[PDB]
Design an enzyme around this catalytic site. Sequence first.
Site, PDB file in Angstrom:
ATOM      1  N   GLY A   1      42.418   1.246  32.822  1.00  0.00           N
ATOM      2  CA  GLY A   1      41.825  -0.063  32.634  1.00  0.00           C
ATOM      3  C   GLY A   1      42.688  -1.204  33.136  1.00  0.00           C
ATOM      4  O   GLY A   1      43.244  -1.143  34.239  1.00  0.00           O
TER       5      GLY A   1
ATOM      6  N   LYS B   1      44.937  -5.440  26.423  1.00  0.00           N
ATOM      7  CA  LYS B   1      44.868  -4.192  27.166  1.00  0.00           C
ATOM      8  C   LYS B   1      43.544  -3.511  26.843  1.00  0.00           C
ATOM      9  O   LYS B   1      43.214  -3.306  25.669  1.00  0.00           O
ATOM     10  CB  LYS B   1      46.049  -3.288  26.810  1.00  0.00           C
TER      11      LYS B   1
ATOM     12  N   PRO C   1      54.496 -15.183  29.394  1.00  0.00           N
ATOM     13  CA  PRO C   1      54.025 -15.861  30.615  1.00  0.00           C
ATOM     14  C   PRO C   1      54.986 -15.844  31.786  1.00  0.00           C
ATOM     15  O   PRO C   1      54.592 -16.284  32.870  1.00  0.00           O
ATOM     16  CB  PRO C   1      53.801 -17.301  30.139  1.00  0.00           C
TER      17      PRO C   1
ATOM     18  N   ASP D   1      58.934   5.395  29.560  1.00  0.00           N
ATOM     19  CA  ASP D   1      58.419   4.764  30.783  1.00  0.00           C
ATOM     20  C   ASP D   1      59.180   3.482  31.119  1.00  0.00           C
ATOM     21  O   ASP D   1      58.597   2.497  31.587  1.00  0.00           O
ATOM     22  CB  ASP D   1      56.918   4.501  30.669  1.00  0.00           C
TER      23      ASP D   1
ATOM     24  N   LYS E   1      60.881   0.944  33.384  1.00  0.00           N
ATOM     25  CA  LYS E   1      60.864   0.516  34.779  1.00  0.00           C
ATOM     26  C   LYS E   1      60.612  -0.995  34.796  1.00  0.00           C
ATOM     27  O   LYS E   1      60.096  -1.542  33.811  1.00  0.00           O
ATOM     28  CB  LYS E   1      59.794   1.261  35.599  1.00  0.00           C
ATOM     29  N   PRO E   2      60.948  -1.687  35.900  1.00  0.00           N
ATOM     30  CA  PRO E   2      60.784  -3.157  35.909  1.00  0.00           C
ATOM     31  C   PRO E   2      59.347  -3.620  35.720  1.00  0.00           C
ATOM     32  O   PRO E   2      59.121  -4.724  35.208  1.00  0.00           O
ATOM     33  CB  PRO E   2      61.318  -3.567  37.284  1.00  0.00           C
TER      34      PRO E   2
ATOM     35  N   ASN F   1      57.343  -2.700  33.538  1.00  0.00           N
ATOM     36  CA  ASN F   1      57.036  -2.734  32.114  1.00  0.00           C
ATOM     37  C   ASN F   1      57.870  -3.736  31.345  1.00  0.00           C
ATOM     38  O   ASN F   1      57.747  -3.808  30.114  1.00  0.00           O
ATOM     39  CB  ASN F   1      57.233  -1.361  31.489  1.00  0.00           C
TER      40      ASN F   1
ATOM     41  N   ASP G   1      53.889  -1.713  27.257  1.00  0.00           N
ATOM     42  CA  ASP G   1      53.355  -0.419  27.658  1.00  0.00           C
ATOM     43  C   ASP G   1      54.042   0.715  26.919  1.00  0.00           C
ATOM     44  O   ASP G   1      54.980   1.353  27.427  1.00  0.00           O
ATOM     45  CB  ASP G   1      53.456  -0.171  29.159  1.00  0.00           C
TER      46      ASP G   1
ATOM     47  N   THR H   1      57.213   8.042  35.158  1.00  0.00           N
ATOM     48  CA  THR H   1      57.064   7.539  36.523  1.00  0.00           C
ATOM     49  C   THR H   1      58.070   8.236  37.418  1.00  0.00           C
ATOM     50  O   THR H   1      59.246   8.283  37.069  1.00  0.00           O
ATOM     51  CB  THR H   1      57.274   6.020  36.565  1.00  0.00           C
TER      52      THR H   1
END
Lengths: 353, 13
Positions: free
Chosen positions: A58, A75, A127, A169, A171-172, A174, A187, A204
């Site tokens: 999604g 989400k 933001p 998970d 990683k940049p 997230n 996430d 990933t």
Amino acid sequence: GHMGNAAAAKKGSEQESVKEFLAKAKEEFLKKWESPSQNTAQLDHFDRIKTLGTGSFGRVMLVKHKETGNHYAMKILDKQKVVKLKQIEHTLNEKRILQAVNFPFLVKLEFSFKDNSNLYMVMEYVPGGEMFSHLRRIGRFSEPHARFYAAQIVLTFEYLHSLDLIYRDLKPENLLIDQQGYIQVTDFGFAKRVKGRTWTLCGTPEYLAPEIILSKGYNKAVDWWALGVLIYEMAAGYPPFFADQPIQIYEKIVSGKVRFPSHFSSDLKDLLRNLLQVDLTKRFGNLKNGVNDIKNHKWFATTDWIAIYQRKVEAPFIPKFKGPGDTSNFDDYEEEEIRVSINEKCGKEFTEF
Amino acid sequence: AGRTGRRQAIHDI
Ligand SMILES: N#Cc1c(N2CCCC2)n[nH]c1N
């Protein structure tokens, strides 16, 4: 020794205070874990503004709560897209963990609900955008800059692992930057409560520990490997195991070889060799001294861990924000109308959500 | 050479 009298005593007292904090944090977590929340809103309570990001199941949208006017990140998961067995279990993990945790660098879940077609998780809107896009735009972060972000991940993993939670998970993509320049981890789709080992092949490719690729039962040390990958990518601009196709990435990960840019400090290379360690009896974060091998490493010598937690360190970068609802720090995505079927889909699979 | 865009996580395999 390396520390004199006053330094050694201050460090020991600091480490005991961490233990006291984590014990209280576990009590608070378990109360919320034992009795979760659900159905705390519905879709027509929000105006949908813009897609902030997409994924397999999604999207995440900026939404505006109609009654309060507050902005949130929503989400949306298509229940029918959540097809595979581990996709289902992982979505229930994500909601239950997010509603129970509480830490300054973990995004806050505000509402959860579902309808005939979708699952919804309504979170704080962050933001400043993804670390990913700032990193790709500038190329690479300086070592002090990378260290500021890394310290927040170290503390966040110390917190999660104390609750027997693995994140899985990092990683940049997230990692979101808030209005003060600090990190918000989002996430939790791969987060899981694990007392010892777990076996799911997920994550990933560039960030997978070798034991995952090799179909071994693995533990929370996979998060410390991923921290090594993250620090390397922040400081270099590209990750250490870098190839166009996942199978090629996997071959590099399991080899036990890493090369470093010539501009990496020796302290940084030493830390990374000990995080990106294929031998689990040698990997930092997995040894007798636990997280303290990382926190006490030379590369973190200038890091005031308490000050980072209290958010009292000047951030290297403050995002520009033009007001509530501003999306200027996010990339654009194709918009697709949200459709809710007349018939309930996959009702039994998501009873607990 | 390698992947420079956003990277999707994989739930299996
Ligand atoms: N803000 C925000 C946000 C988010 N994303 C994913 C794509 C960019 C924003 N995921 N979870 C959140 N709380």
